DNA sequence: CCGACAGCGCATCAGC
DNA sequence: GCTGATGCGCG
DNA sequence: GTCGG
């Protein structure tokens, strides 16, 4: 974190468009930025070096000029004081609270955890569930909790079916020594891109890990994703872990190549490869990788039996998870 | 300039 | 009930 | 806010 001071400002830059300003190209502009810088392997002496790199134009130099010189930016100081601003960002940070409905809440004045609190009523059932686990969905994961966790999905999914496959994707697959919260592409080869043979694939395998008090809550479910809560057994006399964000994902088997590149992530490596990829005339999601027609219509999927295929399509030289780290 | 900026699942709502 | 738009979330 | 053409 050669340049921590830096990326840090336009992270909270890029928070301030996305919660308060809703503009969201500037929000990804900022955080494009901030990626490009964070791996830069320099520690930055001006505004014109860090205009060099990509994703970095004008008006972001001058403002790592300004930073630079007195350690802080005058736009922020000023969005920090602002009431209405800082309530805002505040509100986002309530899984299930967005700009719009951030927004919302402090016009009718609600702006504080203890307005959040008294007013449960105002809240649909993901907002209430990220309300009551506000503080702990704020903690970071110890891999070795992660590695915990990763044993118990493994085994419970292994004891429902023991054709299904689970894998831990998101920054743990990435190798980082902490991570956010767990993320899951789940396989079973009675559901492909042709058929699904089998009906509750996902709510069998959810059901399970409810069963053994694994998974607490659930902020969404559908036929293939699951999005909830889940929380590490502790032992007599020791304190409770805190409450984890799970999410599951269950694609088609055919399809796992392009799943686990997308659930691997990082978000910002999978936007800079998906542009990539239109650029190269081919598009990606987590299902498929497809040629663009003259009309820059979606062909049909092109056979992938690797991610490195994926990689090979587009002309880029593959890279491990760990290096996806943007 | 000025168009493009990745892609998609689930929840909720409006309108029919 | 459905469809389409929008909010929010995930990487 | 930045970039490519
Ligand atoms: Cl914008
Ligand atoms: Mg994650
Ligand atoms: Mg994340
Ligand atoms: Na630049
Ligand atoms: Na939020
Ligand atoms: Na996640």
């Known amino acids: 974190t050669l340049n921590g001071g830096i990326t840090d400002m336009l992270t909270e830059l890029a928070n301030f468009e996305k919660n308060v300003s809703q503009a969201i190209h500037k929000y990804n502009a900022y955080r494009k930025a901030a990626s490009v810088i964070a791996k830069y392997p320099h520690k930055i002496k001006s505004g014109a070096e860090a205009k060099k790199l990509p994703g970095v134009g004008t008006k972001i130099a001058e403002k790592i000029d300004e930073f630079l010189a007195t350690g802080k930016l005058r736009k922020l100081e ?6 209405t601003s800082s309530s805002i960002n505040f509100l986002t940070r309530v899984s299930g609270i967005g ?6 809440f402090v016009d009718e004045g609600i702006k504080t955890l203890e307005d959040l609190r008294k007013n449960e009523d105002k809240l649909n059932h993901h907002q209430r569930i990220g309300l009551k686990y506000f503080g702990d969905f704020e903690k970071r994961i110890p891999r070795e909790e992660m590695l915990q ?8 999914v292994k004891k429902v079916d023991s054709e299904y496959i689970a894998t831990v994707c998101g920054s743990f697959r990435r190798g980082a020594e902490s991570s956010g919260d767990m993320d899951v ?18 709510h069998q395998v959810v059901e399970q890990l ?3 008090h694994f998974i607490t809550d659930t902020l969404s479910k559908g036929e293939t994703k699951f999005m909830g809560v889940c929380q590490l057994p502790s032992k007599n006399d020791e304190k ?4 984890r964000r799970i999410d599951i994902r269950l694609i088609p088997k ?8 997308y659930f691997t992530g990082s978000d910002i490596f999978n936007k800079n490869m998906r542009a990539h990829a239109l650029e190269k005339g081919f598009t990606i999601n987590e299902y498929t990788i497809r040629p663009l027609g003259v009309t820059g219509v979606a062909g049909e999927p092109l056979p992938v039996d690797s991610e490195k295929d994926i990689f090979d399509y587009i002309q ?10 943007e």
């Open 78 to 83: 000023k969005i920090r004081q602002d009431d």
């Open 99 to 104: 700009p719009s409905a951030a927004r919302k």
């Open 149 to 156: 966790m990763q044993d118990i999905v493994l085994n419970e």
């Open 185 to 202: 592409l789940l396989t079973h080869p009675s559901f492909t891109s042709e058929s699904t043979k089998q009906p509750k694939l996902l």
């Open 210 to 212: 409810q069963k053994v």
């Open 240 to 243: 409770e872990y805190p409450h």
């Open 254 to 261: 055919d399809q796992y190549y392009c799943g686990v590149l």
């Open 316 to 325: 880029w030289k593959y890279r491990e998870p760990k290096d996806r780290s």
